Design a protein around this motif. Sequence first.
Motif: not given
Ligand SMILES: COc1cc2nc(C)nc(N[C@H](C)c3cccc(-c4cn[nH]c4)c3)c2cc1OC
Length: 472
Positions: A332-333, A311, A302, A328-329, A317, A305-306, A325
Amino acid sequence: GAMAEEQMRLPSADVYRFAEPDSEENIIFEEGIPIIKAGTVIKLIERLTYHMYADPNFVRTFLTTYRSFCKPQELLSLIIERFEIPEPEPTEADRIAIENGDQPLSAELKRFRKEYIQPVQLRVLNVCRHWVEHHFYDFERDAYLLQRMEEFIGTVRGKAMKKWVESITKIIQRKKIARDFQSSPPTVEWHISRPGHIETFDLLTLHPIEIARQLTLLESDLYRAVQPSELVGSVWTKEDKEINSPNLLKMIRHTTNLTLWFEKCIVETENLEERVAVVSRIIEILQVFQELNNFNGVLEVVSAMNSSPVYRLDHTFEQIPSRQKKILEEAHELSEDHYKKYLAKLRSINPPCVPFFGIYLTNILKTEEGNPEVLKRHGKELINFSKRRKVAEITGEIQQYQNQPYCLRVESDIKRFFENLNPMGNSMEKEFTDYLFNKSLEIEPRNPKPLPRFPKKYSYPLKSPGVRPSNP
Ligand SMILES: COc1cc2nc(C)nc(N[C@H](C)c3cccc(-c4cn[nH]c4)c3)c2cc1OC
């Protein structure tokens, strides 16, 4: 009166320092055995070896945390001083009996030996045993400290002291000797790289299941080696960090190295389609970390990826499967709302696991920074022990997960590969992360500029073998 009678049965201040009366200028309790809120070091040592009762909670917390307010050398001098209790003079009647060559009654002297000296001396040895048992690293780092302890323990004399001296001596021996599965584990999974072919070992060539397993084993060993004292007083951020917090520093350096390695793998794959495969494979490694309850590992992915270089890669992505995805979401949560879902997940699952370590360093830093080192009463500084206890409670949470071995076979060459990750090379982190971000701008430029194409770097198949293990 009765108060002056009790106090004068203890030794006077001119011959002994650990018998002054309690007061607001030297000790405070919290709002059963009393809970010490603050005090002078002399009062903490007195209460650490208190004559009236045993106090295992205070002894445990003290020996975990004392280095934040007292050096090991100084502690040993204080408990040895504490031990050396002077006896009161004989009464007038007994002085006369001794004058005539007769045996004195010594009623109060015998009571003082019975009810004060012997208990305190036994408490000092209980502290010595707990010290060598659970914090032997103090004596490993300081050979002179060990020489002092063994000289002290070796010159203790008495009937009631013999058993304690032997048990302390026995534990000291075992710690020098140490210094010099349950069920069937699954089959080691391979993909492109063959067993022994260490030159070909890489992110896409090893099997993603096996990368997760070997990293989980590596991170489990690193998790379990961290002692509570390595976190107390923020000593991992001070100048003597290498001696004081070696196991913690190793864990942090691994996290940094793996996380930046993931970022390096992604952004140095300049071809879009290959980079999608790289990112997809790292997500698969996260899924197997999740299967193994390696939350440290999950949040390392995470973090990668962030990061700023990864990112922003919208085109990469875009091609990642919706299911990946979603994973990954959800990963993050786990961190949102002060790690609420992570903590709920951590409580709910069964062992074995590897907890996310970063959260302990965050909360300890806030506790260290947010509470004062000393409390003041009537112009006197008292050591804030409640601060140390709160820090010790957090390190207590670490320890409850430090005996959860994995039923997974170690592969020595893959372990060495991940132990020797050096993505930064000769560069410092800041400059390397600037390089990583500049690479991201090259491979995926900002909206005004178009998206150029890049050649392939991989000469082997990119299709993943998957995350389900061999059970046909
Ligand atoms: C508030 O800012 C963020 C929100 C995020 N909200 C989710 C639900 N997930 C994240 N990160 C995950 C690990 C992530 C990383 C990279 C790509 C993706 C992704 C998912 N779908 N499309 C791109 C998702 C987030 C990362 C944030 O700041 C770096």
